[PDB]
Amino acid sequence: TFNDVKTSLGITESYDIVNAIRNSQGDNFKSYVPLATANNVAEVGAGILINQTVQNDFITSLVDRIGLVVIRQVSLNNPLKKFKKGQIPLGRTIEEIYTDITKEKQYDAEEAEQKVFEREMPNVKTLFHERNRQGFYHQTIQDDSLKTAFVSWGNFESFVSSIINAIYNSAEVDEYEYMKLLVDNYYSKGLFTTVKIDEPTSSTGALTEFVKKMRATARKLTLPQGSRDWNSMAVRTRSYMEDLHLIIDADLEAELDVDVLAKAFNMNRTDFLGNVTVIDGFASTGLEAVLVDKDWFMVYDNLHKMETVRNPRGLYWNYYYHVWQTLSVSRFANAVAFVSGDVPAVTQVIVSPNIAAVKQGGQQQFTAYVRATNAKDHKVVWSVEGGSTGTAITGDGLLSVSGNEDNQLTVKATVDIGTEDKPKLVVGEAVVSIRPNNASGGAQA
Amino acid sequence: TFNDVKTSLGITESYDIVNAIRNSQGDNFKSYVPLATANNVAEVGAG
Amino acid sequence: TQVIVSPNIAAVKQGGQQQFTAYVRATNAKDHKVVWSVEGGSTGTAITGD
Amino acid sequence: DEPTSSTGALTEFVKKMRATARKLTLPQGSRDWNSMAVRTRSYMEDLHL
Protein backbone atom coordinates (compact mmCIF):
# COMPACT_ATOMS: atom_id res chain seq x y z
CA THR A 1 0.00 0.00 0.00
CA PHE A 2 2.55 2.53 -1.27
CA ASN A 3 3.04 5.65 -3.37
CA ASP A 4 5.74 8.04 -4.64
CA VAL A 5 8.31 5.28 -4.94
CA LYS A 6 11.27 6.67 -6.84
CA THR A 7 12.71 3.33 -8.22
CA SER A 8 16.11 4.69 -7.12
CA LEU A 9 15.76 3.71 -3.49
CA GLY A 10 19.10 2.49 -2.22
CA ILE A 11 20.99 3.79 -5.21
CA THR A 12 24.07 5.90 -4.73
CA GLU A 13 25.15 6.52 -8.29
CA SER A 14 28.91 6.90 -8.24
CA TYR A 15 28.34 8.28 -11.70
CA ASP A 16 25.20 8.64 -13.76
CA ILE A 17 25.86 6.25 -16.66
CA VAL A 18 23.80 8.38 -19.01
CA ASN A 19 23.86 12.08 -18.28
CA ALA A 20 27.39 12.40 -17.01
CA ILE A 21 28.83 10.22 -19.72
CA ARG A 22 27.00 8.35 -22.48
CA ASN A 23 25.41 11.44 -23.97
CA SER A 24 28.70 13.28 -23.74
CA GLN A 25 31.41 10.67 -24.26
CA GLY A 26 34.10 10.99 -26.87
CA ASP A 27 35.70 8.13 -24.89
CA ASN A 28 35.60 4.47 -23.75
CA PHE A 29 31.82 4.35 -23.36
CA LYS A 30 31.51 4.55 -27.17
CA SER A 31 30.30 1.01 -27.63
CA TYR A 32 26.97 1.89 -26.03
CA VAL A 33 26.14 4.75 -28.42
CA PRO A 34 24.82 2.45 -31.23
CA LEU A 35 22.32 1.02 -28.73
CA ALA A 36 19.14 3.07 -28.78
CA THR A 37 17.15 1.83 -25.79
CA ALA A 38 20.14 2.11 -23.46
CA ASN A 39 18.24 4.58 -21.27
CA ASN A 40 15.37 2.20 -20.63
CA VAL A 41 17.87 -0.41 -19.50
CA ALA A 42 19.73 2.12 -17.36
CA GLU A 43 16.49 3.00 -15.56
CA VAL A 44 15.01 -0.35 -14.48
CA GLY A 45 17.65 -2.94 -15.35
CA ALA A 46 19.21 -3.39 -11.93
CA GLY A 47 16.07 -4.75 -10.38
CA ILE A 48 13.11 -2.84 -8.98
CA LEU A 49 12.57 -3.08 -5.26
CA ILE A 50 8.93 -2.06 -4.91
CA ASN A 51 6.37 -3.21 -7.42
CA GLN A 52 4.34 -0.61 -9.25
CA THR A 53 1.08 -1.05 -11.10
CA VAL A 54 2.33 -0.04 -14.52
CA GLN A 55 -0.42 0.50 -17.06
CA ASN A 56 -0.07 -0.95 -20.52
CA ASP A 57 1.53 1.29 -23.14
CA PHE A 58 -1.04 0.90 -25.88
CA ILE A 59 -4.16 0.55 -23.75
CA THR A 60 -4.16 2.43 -20.52
CA SER A 61 -6.33 0.85 -17.82
CA LEU A 62 -4.76 -2.50 -18.57
CA VAL A 63 -2.42 -3.69 -15.77
CA ASP A 64 0.86 -5.25 -16.86
CA ARG A 65 0.61 -8.49 -14.87
CA ILE A 66 3.66 -10.26 -13.33
CA GLY A 67 4.13 -13.29 -15.53
CA LEU A 68 6.86 -15.45 -13.98
CA VAL A 69 7.58 -16.07 -10.30
CA VAL A 70 10.86 -17.79 -9.51
CA ILE A 71 11.51 -18.77 -5.90
CA ARG A 72 15.16 -18.65 -4.87
CA GLN A 73 16.15 -21.13 -2.21
CA VAL A 74 19.49 -21.94 -0.59
CA SER A 75 20.64 -24.47 1.99
CA LEU A 76 23.32 -23.36 4.41
CA ASN A 77 25.57 -25.68 6.38
CA ASN A 78 27.98 -25.45 9.27
CA PRO A 79 31.45 -26.41 8.08
CA LEU A 80 32.50 -26.56 11.74
CA LYS A 81 30.08 -29.35 12.65
CA LYS A 82 33.02 -31.73 13.00
CA PHE A 83 34.18 -29.74 16.03
CA LYS A 84 31.30 -30.99 18.17
CA LYS A 85 31.71 -33.58 20.90
CA GLY A 86 28.18 -34.90 21.16
CA GLN A 87 25.26 -34.62 23.50
CA ILE A 88 25.15 -33.91 27.21
CA PRO A 89 21.98 -35.31 28.71
CA LEU A 90 21.56 -34.94 32.47
CA GLY A 91 24.02 -32.30 33.60
CA ARG A 92 24.94 -28.69 33.35
CA THR A 93 28.65 -28.24 33.95
CA ILE A 94 31.73 -30.07 32.72
CA GLU A 95 34.80 -30.72 34.87
CA GLU A 96 38.12 -30.64 33.04
CA ILE A 97 41.08 -31.78 35.12
CA TYR A 98 44.71 -31.50 34.10
CA THR A 99 47.71 -32.51 36.20
CA ASP A 100 51.02 -31.37 34.86
CA ILE A 101 54.68 -31.67 35.58
CA THR A 102 56.56 -30.66 38.72
CA LYS A 103 59.89 -29.00 39.45
CA GLU A 104 62.82 -31.19 40.34
CA LYS A 105 64.54 -30.82 43.67
CA GLN A 106 68.27 -31.08 44.08
CA TYR A 107 69.41 -34.26 45.81
CA ASP A 108 70.27 -33.16 49.32
CA ALA A 109 70.60 -35.60 52.17
CA GLU A 110 71.07 -33.03 54.92
CA GLU A 111 67.68 -31.41 54.34
CA ALA A 112 66.05 -34.82 54.10
CA GLU A 113 65.88 -35.31 57.84
CA GLN A 114 62.83 -33.13 58.40
CA LYS A 115 61.16 -33.49 55.04
CA VAL A 116 60.33 -37.17 54.77
CA PHE A 117 56.68 -36.50 55.48
CA GLU A 118 56.77 -33.02 53.99
CA ARG A 119 53.71 -32.60 51.85
CA GLU A 120 54.03 -31.06 48.37
CA MET A 121 50.69 -30.99 46.56
CA PRO A 122 50.45 -31.58 42.79
CA ASN A 123 50.00 -28.79 40.28
CA VAL A 124 46.45 -29.37 39.11
CA LYS A 125 44.41 -27.00 36.98
CA THR A 126 40.65 -27.41 36.77
CA LEU A 127 38.33 -25.87 34.26
CA PHE A 128 34.55 -25.62 34.17
CA HIS A 129 32.35 -25.30 31.12
CA GLU A 130 28.82 -24.10 31.74
CA ARG A 131 25.93 -24.52 29.37
CA ASN A 132 25.85 -21.24 27.47
CA ARG A 133 23.48 -21.14 24.54
CA GLN A 134 19.81 -21.52 25.22
CA GLY A 135 17.82 -20.01 22.39
CA PHE A 136 14.96 -20.78 20.05
CA TYR A 137 13.78 -19.94 16.56
CA HIS A 138 10.37 -18.50 15.93
CA GLN A 139 8.52 -18.70 12.63
CA THR A 140 4.89 -18.12 11.70
CA ILE A 141 3.18 -19.54 8.65
CA GLN A 142 -0.24 -17.98 8.08
CA ASP A 143 -1.34 -20.57 5.53
CA ASP A 144 -4.38 -18.58 4.51
CA SER A 145 -3.10 -15.06 4.02
CA LEU A 146 -0.30 -16.22 1.76
CA LYS A 147 -2.71 -17.60 -0.83
CA THR A 148 -3.21 -14.00 -1.90
CA ALA A 149 0.33 -13.58 -3.19
CA PHE A 150 0.32 -16.73 -5.35
CA VAL A 151 -1.87 -17.93 -8.19
CA SER A 152 -0.17 -21.33 -8.48
CA TRP A 153 -0.36 -24.35 -6.32
CA GLY A 154 3.25 -25.17 -6.80
CA ASN A 155 4.62 -21.80 -5.92
CA PHE A 156 2.69 -22.03 -2.67
CA GLU A 157 4.39 -25.28 -1.65
CA SER A 158 7.68 -23.97 -3.00
CA PHE A 159 7.31 -21.06 -0.60
CA VAL A 160 6.04 -22.88 2.48
CA SER A 161 8.94 -25.30 2.12
CA SER A 162 11.44 -22.46 2.12
CA ILE A 163 10.14 -21.19 5.45
CA ILE A 164 10.81 -24.67 6.75
CA ASN A 165 14.40 -24.49 5.60
CA ALA A 166 14.58 -20.90 6.79
CA ILE A 167 14.53 -22.37 10.28
CA TYR A 168 17.04 -25.06 9.45
CA ASN A 169 19.35 -22.58 7.80
CA SER A 170 19.00 -20.09 10.65
CA ALA A 171 20.01 -22.68 13.20
CA GLU A 172 22.94 -23.94 11.18
CA VAL A 173 24.28 -20.46 10.53
CA ASP A 174 24.28 -19.45 14.18
CA GLU A 175 25.83 -22.83 14.90
CA TYR A 176 28.56 -21.68 12.55
CA GLU A 177 28.55 -18.23 14.01
CA TYR A 178 28.54 -19.09 17.72
CA MET A 179 31.61 -21.28 17.30
CA LYS A 180 33.26 -18.47 15.40
CA LEU A 181 32.58 -16.20 18.35
CA LEU A 182 34.64 -18.46 20.61
CA VAL A 183 37.74 -17.69 18.57
CA ASP A 184 37.03 -13.96 18.56
CA ASN A 185 36.21 -14.10 22.24
CA TYR A 186 39.40 -15.94 23.15
CA TYR A 187 41.53 -13.54 21.17
CA SER A 188 39.85 -10.50 22.66
CA LYS A 189 40.54 -11.86 26.15
CA GLY A 190 44.22 -12.23 25.29
CA LEU A 191 44.00 -15.99 25.62
CA PHE A 192 45.43 -16.86 22.22
CA THR A 193 49.15 -17.43 21.93
CA THR A 194 49.90 -14.58 19.57
CA VAL A 195 52.25 -15.31 16.68
CA LYS A 196 52.94 -12.65 14.09
CA ILE A 197 53.05 -13.87 10.50
CA ASP A 198 53.26 -10.64 8.48
CA GLU A 199 56.40 -9.18 10.06
CA PRO A 200 59.16 -10.37 7.71
CA THR A 201 62.39 -9.20 9.47
CA SER A 202 64.28 -10.56 6.39
CA SER A 203 64.99 -8.87 3.04
CA THR A 204 63.01 -9.22 -0.21
CA GLY A 205 61.79 -12.67 -1.13
CA ALA A 206 59.20 -12.81 1.64
CA LEU A 207 56.41 -14.39 -0.32
CA THR A 208 56.56 -17.56 1.80
CA GLU A 209 56.90 -15.55 5.03
CA PHE A 210 53.70 -16.93 6.47
CA VAL A 211 54.25 -20.49 5.25
CA LYS A 212 57.59 -20.86 7.01
CA LYS A 213 56.00 -19.63 10.24
CA MET A 214 52.83 -21.71 10.04
CA ARG A 215 54.88 -24.84 9.42
CA ALA A 216 57.40 -24.16 12.16
CA THR A 217 54.84 -23.22 14.80
CA ALA A 218 52.73 -26.16 13.68
CA ARG A 219 55.76 -28.33 14.36
CA LYS A 220 56.51 -26.65 17.69
CA LEU A 221 53.10 -27.72 18.99
CA THR A 222 54.08 -31.36 18.49
CA LEU A 223 57.52 -31.72 20.04
CA PRO A 224 57.38 -34.76 22.33
CA GLN A 225 58.73 -32.92 25.35
CA GLY A 226 55.86 -30.52 24.95
CA SER A 227 55.97 -26.86 25.59
CA ARG A 228 54.73 -24.49 28.27
CA ASP A 229 53.89 -21.57 26.03
CA TRP A 230 50.97 -22.48 23.80
CA ASN A 231 48.23 -22.91 26.41
CA SER A 232 46.51 -20.20 28.35
CA MET A 233 47.05 -22.05 31.63
CA ALA A 234 50.81 -22.38 31.01
CA VAL A 235 50.87 -26.14 31.39
CA ARG A 236 53.15 -28.53 29.59
CA THR A 237 50.88 -30.08 26.98
CA ARG A 238 51.52 -31.64 23.61
CA SER A 239 49.81 -32.15 20.28
CA TYR A 240 50.01 -35.31 18.19
CA MET A 241 49.79 -33.54 14.74
CA GLU A 242 46.85 -35.64 13.62
CA ASP A 243 44.62 -33.52 15.82
CA LEU A 244 45.86 -30.14 14.59
CA HIS A 245 43.06 -28.25 12.87
CA LEU A 246 43.72 -24.98 11.09
CA ILE A 247 40.81 -22.58 10.69
CA ILE A 248 42.02 -20.17 8.03
CA ASP A 249 40.90 -17.02 6.25
CA ALA A 250 39.96 -17.57 2.62
CA ASP A 251 42.18 -14.64 1.71
CA LEU A 252 45.10 -16.55 3.20
CA GLU A 253 44.56 -19.94 1.57
CA ALA A 254 45.08 -18.38 -1.85
CA GLU A 255 48.29 -16.73 -0.64
CA LEU A 256 49.49 -20.26 0.00
CA ASP A 257 47.97 -21.71 -3.11
CA VAL A 258 49.37 -19.18 -5.56
CA ASP A 259 52.62 -17.87 -4.10
CA VAL A 260 53.76 -21.25 -2.74
CA LEU A 261 51.93 -24.30 -4.12
CA ALA A 262 52.32 -23.44 -7.72
CA LYS A 263 56.10 -23.43 -8.29
CA ALA A 264 56.28 -26.26 -5.76
CA PHE A 265 57.78 -29.35 -7.34
CA ASN A 266 57.14 -31.20 -4.06
CA MET A 267 53.96 -29.85 -2.50
CA ASN A 268 54.23 -32.05 0.58
CA ARG A 269 57.16 -29.92 1.72
CA THR A 270 55.02 -26.77 1.67
CA ASP A 271 51.45 -27.72 2.51
CA PHE A 272 50.12 -26.47 5.82
CA LEU A 273 50.53 -29.11 8.49
CA GLY A 274 47.36 -30.58 9.83
CA ASN A 275 43.79 -30.36 8.70
CA VAL A 276 42.79 -27.15 6.97
CA THR A 277 39.31 -25.64 7.24
CA VAL A 278 38.62 -22.47 5.32
CA ILE A 279 36.32 -19.86 6.75
CA ASP A 280 35.60 -16.42 5.35
CA GLY A 281 37.87 -14.82 7.95
CA PHE A 282 37.57 -13.78 11.55
CA ALA A 283 35.95 -10.74 13.06
CA SER A 284 39.07 -9.87 15.03
CA THR A 285 41.45 -7.23 13.79
CA GLY A 286 44.54 -8.57 12.07
CA LEU A 287 43.77 -12.17 13.03
CA GLU A 288 44.43 -14.24 9.95
CA ALA A 289 44.26 -17.87 11.07
CA VAL A 290 44.11 -20.05 14.16
CA LEU A 291 45.74 -23.46 14.76
CA VAL A 292 44.17 -25.60 17.47
CA ASP A 293 43.94 -29.11 18.78
CA LYS A 294 40.82 -31.15 18.38
CA ASP A 295 40.48 -30.83 22.15
CA TRP A 296 40.32 -27.03 22.04
CA PHE A 297 36.61 -27.11 21.28
CA MET A 298 34.28 -28.05 24.13
CA VAL A 299 31.08 -27.75 22.10
CA TYR A 300 28.21 -29.94 23.27
CA ASP A 301 24.53 -30.45 22.53
CA ASN A 302 21.70 -30.53 25.00
CA LEU A 303 18.46 -30.09 23.04
CA HIS A 304 17.19 -30.04 19.52
CA LYS A 305 13.41 -29.81 19.73
CA MET A 306 11.07 -28.76 16.96
CA GLU A 307 7.72 -27.88 18.46
CA THR A 308 4.64 -26.40 16.86
CA VAL A 309 1.25 -25.02 17.78
CA ARG A 310 -1.83 -23.98 15.80
CA ASN A 311 -3.76 -20.78 16.23
CA PRO A 312 -7.45 -21.24 15.38
CA ARG A 313 -8.27 -17.56 15.70
CA GLY A 314 -5.40 -16.34 13.54
CA LEU A 315 -5.38 -19.40 11.29
CA TYR A 316 -1.65 -19.87 11.65
CA TRP A 317 1.13 -22.04 12.93
CA ASN A 318 4.02 -21.02 15.13
CA TYR A 319 7.15 -23.10 14.74
CA TYR A 320 9.60 -23.20 17.63
CA TYR A 321 13.05 -24.71 17.21
CA HIS A 322 14.93 -24.98 20.48
CA VAL A 323 18.68 -25.48 20.31
CA TRP A 324 20.41 -25.67 23.68
CA GLN A 325 24.17 -26.04 23.65
CA THR A 326 27.31 -25.92 25.73
CA LEU A 327 29.68 -23.72 23.74
CA SER A 328 33.10 -23.82 25.30
CA VAL A 329 36.84 -23.75 24.83
CA SER A 330 39.57 -25.80 26.49
CA ARG A 331 42.19 -23.53 28.02
CA PHE A 332 44.42 -26.62 28.36
CA ALA A 333 44.78 -27.16 24.63
CA ASN A 334 47.25 -25.48 22.33
CA ALA A 335 45.75 -22.62 20.37
CA VAL A 336 47.98 -20.42 18.24
CA ALA A 337 46.89 -17.10 16.72
CA PHE A 338 48.53 -16.17 13.43
CA VAL A 339 48.07 -12.42 13.40
CA SER A 340 49.22 -9.68 11.05
CA GLY A 341 48.64 -6.22 12.46
CA ASP A 342 50.34 -4.47 15.32
CA VAL A 343 49.85 -6.22 18.64
CA PRO A 344 50.43 -5.46 22.31
CA ALA A 345 53.73 -6.54 23.78
CA VAL A 346 52.12 -8.64 26.53
CA THR A 347 48.79 -10.33 25.88
CA GLN A 348 48.46 -12.52 28.98
CA VAL A 349 49.96 -12.90 32.44
CA ILE A 350 49.25 -16.27 34.07
CA VAL A 351 49.55 -16.42 37.86
CA SER A 352 50.38 -19.98 38.58
CA PRO A 353 48.10 -21.99 40.94
CA ASN A 354 45.16 -19.62 40.19
CA ILE A 355 43.40 -20.41 43.51
CA ALA A 356 44.55 -21.24 47.02
CA ALA A 357 43.45 -21.95 50.57
CA VAL A 358 46.15 -20.51 52.81
CA LYS A 359 45.83 -20.56 56.60
CA GLN A 360 46.27 -17.37 58.65
CA GLY A 361 49.95 -16.95 59.31
CA GLY A 362 50.76 -19.28 56.41
CA GLN A 363 52.48 -18.48 53.16
CA GLN A 364 52.24 -19.31 49.48
CA GLN A 365 54.60 -19.13 46.51
CA PHE A 366 53.28 -17.61 43.29
CA THR A 367 54.67 -17.60 39.76
CA ALA A 368 53.72 -15.38 36.84
CA TYR A 369 54.26 -16.58 33.32
CA VAL A 370 54.14 -13.68 30.87
CA ARG A 371 52.74 -14.27 27.38
CA ALA A 372 54.80 -11.68 25.57
CA THR A 373 55.29 -10.79 21.98
CA ASN A 374 58.69 -9.63 21.14
CA ALA A 375 60.65 -10.49 24.25
CA LYS A 376 61.32 -7.22 26.03
CA ASP A 377 61.18 -9.20 29.34
CA HIS A 378 58.60 -7.12 31.12
CA LYS A 379 59.08 -6.74 34.85
CA VAL A 380 56.35 -8.08 37.14
CA VAL A 381 54.92 -6.29 40.19
CA TRP A 382 53.00 -8.44 42.68
CA SER A 383 50.08 -7.12 44.67
CA VAL A 384 47.35 -8.13 47.11
CA GLU A 385 43.77 -6.87 46.93
CA GLY A 386 41.41 -6.98 49.87
CA GLY A 387 43.86 -7.48 52.72
CA SER A 388 44.76 -5.54 55.83
CA THR A 389 48.04 -4.00 56.96
CA GLY A 390 49.48 -7.48 57.56
CA THR A 391 49.12 -9.38 54.32
CA ALA A 392 51.76 -8.44 51.77
CA ILE A 393 53.51 -10.15 48.88
CA THR A 394 57.07 -9.51 47.85
CA GLY A 395 59.79 -10.25 45.35
CA ASP A 396 59.21 -13.39 43.31
CA GLY A 397 55.60 -13.69 44.39
CA LEU A 398 55.59 -15.02 47.92
CA LEU A 399 52.33 -14.32 49.71
CA SER A 400 52.37 -13.79 53.46
CA VAL A 401 48.87 -14.21 54.87
CA SER A 402 48.58 -12.31 58.13
CA GLY A 403 47.17 -13.93 61.22
CA ASN A 404 44.48 -11.24 61.34
CA GLU A 405 42.52 -11.70 58.12
CA ASP A 406 39.52 -13.64 56.91
CA ASN A 407 39.15 -12.03 53.51
CA GLN A 408 39.16 -13.53 50.06
CA LEU A 409 42.32 -12.15 48.53
CA THR A 410 43.22 -11.23 44.96
CA VAL A 411 46.86 -11.65 43.99
CA LYS A 412 47.94 -9.60 41.00
CA ALA A 413 50.90 -9.71 38.63
CA THR A 414 51.08 -6.24 37.13
CA VAL A 415 52.91 -5.81 33.83
CA ASP A 416 53.05 -2.33 32.34
CA ILE A 417 53.36 -1.99 28.57
CA GLY A 418 52.29 1.61 28.75
CA THR A 419 53.93 4.97 29.29
CA GLU A 420 53.00 8.49 30.37
CA ASP A 421 49.33 8.16 29.57
CA LYS A 422 46.60 6.13 31.11
CA PRO A 423 49.19 3.32 30.86
CA LYS A 424 48.76 -0.22 29.62
CA LEU A 425 48.60 -2.58 32.58
CA VAL A 426 48.39 -6.31 31.90
CA VAL A 427 47.20 -7.72 35.19
CA GLY A 428 46.85 -11.43 35.77
CA GLU A 429 44.99 -12.45 38.91
CA ALA A 430 44.58 -15.30 41.36
CA VAL A 431 42.12 -15.83 44.22
CA VAL A 432 43.31 -16.75 47.70
CA SER A 433 40.95 -17.60 50.51
CA ILE A 434 41.91 -17.91 54.13
CA ARG A 435 41.34 -20.59 56.75
CA PRO A 436 41.02 -19.27 60.31
CA ASN A 437 43.81 -19.90 62.82
CA ASN A 438 43.48 -20.08 66.58
CA ALA A 439 46.75 -18.15 66.80
CA SER A 440 46.83 -17.86 70.61
CA GLY A 441 45.51 -14.28 70.75
CA GLY A 442 46.69 -10.97 72.08
CA ALA A 443 50.11 -9.46 71.88
CA GLN A 444 53.79 -10.21 71.87
CA ALA A 445 57.24 -9.11 73.00
CA THR B 1 35.07 -21.95 50.54
CA PHE B 2 35.09 -19.26 47.86
CA ASN B 3 31.98 -17.20 48.43
CA ASP B 4 31.99 -14.32 45.91
CA VAL B 5 34.06 -13.80 42.75
CA LYS B 6 33.77 -12.35 39.28
CA THR B 7 33.99 -14.73 36.34
CA SER B 8 36.41 -12.60 34.28
CA LEU B 9 39.20 -13.77 36.54
CA GLY B 10 42.69 -12.74 35.59
CA ILE B 11 41.70 -11.85 32.03
CA THR B 12 43.22 -8.61 30.76
CA GLU B 13 41.61 -7.99 27.42
CA SER B 14 42.54 -5.79 24.49
CA TYR B 15 39.06 -5.06 23.17
CA ASP B 16 35.79 -5.93 24.88
CA ILE B 17 33.54 -8.02 22.70
CA VAL B 18 30.29 -6.69 24.17
CA ASN B 19 31.07 -3.15 23.19
CA ALA B 20 32.66 -4.45 20.04
CA ILE B 21 29.38 -6.15 19.14
CA ARG B 22 26.81 -3.61 20.30
CA ASN B 23 28.64 -0.35 19.72
CA SER B 24 29.85 -1.21 16.24
CA GLN B 25 26.91 -0.98 13.90
CA GLY B 26 29.53 -0.30 11.25
CA ASP B 27 31.25 -3.52 10.24
CA ASN B 28 33.21 -6.71 11.11
CA PHE B 29 30.80 -7.55 13.93
CA LYS B 30 27.33 -7.39 12.46
CA SER B 31 27.34 -11.16 12.01
CA TYR B 32 27.25 -11.45 15.83
CA VAL B 33 24.37 -9.03 16.46
CA PRO B 34 21.66 -11.61 15.49
CA LEU B 35 22.92 -13.89 18.27
CA ALA B 36 20.55 -13.91 21.25
CA THR B 37 22.73 -15.59 23.87
CA ALA B 38 25.97 -13.90 22.84
CA ASN B 39 26.58 -12.55 26.33
CA ASN B 40 26.74 -15.95 27.98
CA VAL B 41 28.97 -17.23 25.18
CA ALA B 42 31.33 -14.26 25.09
CA GLU B 43 31.61 -13.83 28.84
CA VAL B 44 31.73 -17.51 29.77
CA GLY B 45 32.89 -19.52 26.77
CA ALA B 46 36.61 -19.45 27.50
CA GLY B 47 35.94 -21.43 30.66
CA THR C 1 29.86 2.36 -2.08
CA GLN C 2 26.42 1.34 -0.83
CA VAL C 3 24.38 1.40 2.35
CA ILE C 4 21.82 -1.40 2.49
CA VAL C 5 19.00 -0.75 4.92
CA SER C 6 17.77 -4.26 5.29
CA PRO C 7 13.95 -4.85 5.47
CA ASN C 8 13.28 -2.27 2.69
CA ILE C 9 9.49 -2.32 3.25
CA ALA C 10 7.56 -1.93 6.47
CA ALA C 11 3.85 -1.91 7.22
CA VAL C 12 4.01 -0.66 10.78
CA LYS C 13 0.90 -0.32 12.92
CA GLN C 14 -0.02 3.16 14.09
CA GLY C 15 1.64 3.35 17.47
CA GLY C 16 3.77 0.24 17.03
CA GLN C 17 7.39 0.06 16.04
CA GLN C 18 9.93 -1.64 13.81
CA GLN C 19 13.57 -2.73 13.86
CA PHE C 20 15.86 -1.74 10.99
CA THR C 21 19.49 -2.52 10.31
CA ALA C 22 21.94 -1.07 7.84
CA TYR C 23 24.72 -2.87 6.04
CA VAL C 24 27.55 -0.55 5.09
CA ARG C 25 29.75 -1.60 2.18
CA ALA C 26 33.21 -0.65 3.33
CA THR C 27 35.68 -1.23 0.52
CA ASN C 28 38.52 -0.68 2.99
CA ALA C 29 39.47 -1.81 6.48
CA LYS C 30 37.51 0.77 8.44
CA ASP C 31 34.23 1.32 10.25
CA HIS C 32 31.88 4.11 9.28
CA LYS C 33 29.27 5.88 11.37
CA VAL C 34 25.61 5.35 10.52
CA VAL C 35 23.15 8.16 11.19
CA TRP C 36 19.50 7.13 11.18
CA SER C 37 16.74 9.51 10.16
CA VAL C 38 13.00 9.64 9.60
CA GLU C 39 11.55 12.21 7.22
CA GLY C 40 7.89 12.82 6.59
CA GLY C 41 6.75 11.97 10.11
CA SER C 42 4.44 13.76 12.48
CA THR C 43 5.55 15.48 15.66
CA GLY C 44 7.04 12.47 17.29
CA THR C 45 7.81 9.33 15.28
CA ALA C 46 11.58 9.20 15.81
CA ILE C 47 14.24 6.65 15.01
CA THR C 48 16.59 6.29 17.94
CA GLY C 49 19.72 5.62 16.08
CA ASP C 50 20.62 1.93 15.92
CA ASP D 1 75.64 -15.85 7.22
CA GLU D 2 72.22 -16.14 8.89
CA PRO D 3 69.71 -18.72 7.70
CA THR D 4 66.81 -16.26 7.73
CA SER D 5 68.61 -13.54 5.81
CA SER D 6 67.97 -14.44 2.19
CA THR D 7 67.39 -17.55 0.14
CA GLY D 8 71.06 -17.43 -0.79
CA ALA D 9 72.17 -17.67 2.84
CA LEU D 10 69.79 -20.61 3.16
CA THR D 11 71.39 -22.31 0.17
CA GLU D 12 74.98 -21.67 1.27
CA PHE D 13 74.05 -23.20 4.62
CA VAL D 14 72.79 -26.24 2.69
CA LYS D 15 76.08 -26.25 0.80
CA LYS D 16 78.30 -26.16 3.88
CA MET D 17 76.52 -29.03 5.60
CA ARG D 18 76.64 -31.47 2.70
CA ALA D 19 80.29 -30.46 2.43
CA THR D 20 80.95 -31.02 6.11
CA ALA D 21 79.08 -34.32 6.32
CA ARG D 22 81.19 -35.58 3.44
CA LYS D 23 84.35 -34.37 5.17
CA LEU D 24 83.33 -36.20 8.32
CA THR D 25 82.38 -39.41 6.60
CA LEU D 26 85.32 -39.66 4.32
CA PRO D 27 87.42 -42.67 5.11
CA GLN D 28 90.88 -41.41 5.91
CA GLY D 29 89.31 -39.15 8.49
CA SER D 30 90.59 -35.78 9.58
CA ARG D 31 92.27 -34.33 12.60
CA ASP D 32 89.86 -31.51 11.94
CA TRP D 33 86.32 -31.68 13.34
CA ASN D 34 86.91 -32.76 16.92
CA SER D 35 88.26 -31.16 20.07
CA MET D 36 91.06 -33.63 20.80
CA ALA D 37 92.33 -33.50 17.19
CA VAL D 38 92.12 -37.25 17.07
CA ARG D 39 92.24 -38.67 13.57
CA THR D 40 88.82 -40.29 13.75
CA ARG D 41 86.14 -40.82 11.17
CA SER D 42 82.41 -41.08 11.18
CA TYR D 43 79.63 -42.83 9.27
CA MET D 44 76.56 -41.42 7.55
CA GLU D 45 74.09 -43.38 9.64
CA ASP D 46 75.94 -42.10 12.72
CA LEU D 47 75.68 -38.41 11.83
CA HIS D 48 72.78 -36.61 13.44
CA LEU D 49 71.93 -33.13 12.24
UniProtKB/Swiss-Prot annotation, chain A:
Protein name: Major capsid protein
Subcellular location: Virion
InterPro entries attached to this UniProt entry: Big_2
A Pfam cross-reference name: Big_2
Coiled-coil region(s): 104-124
Lineage: Viruses, Duplodnaviria, Heunggongvirae, Uroviricota, Caudoviricetes
Alphabetical keyword list: Capsid protein, Coiled coil, Late protein, T=3 icosahedral capsid protein, Virion
Function (record text): Assembles to form a prolate capsid shell of about 54 nm in length and 45 nm in width, with a T=3, Q=5 symmetry.
GO annotations of cellular component type: T=3 icosahedral viral capsid; viral procapsid
Domain BIG2: 345-424
Description of how the protein assembles with itself and partners: Homohexamer. Homopentamer. The prolate capsid is composed of pentamers and hexamers of the capsid protein.
Organism per entry: Bacillus phage phi29
Family: Belongs to the phi29likevirus major capsid protein family.
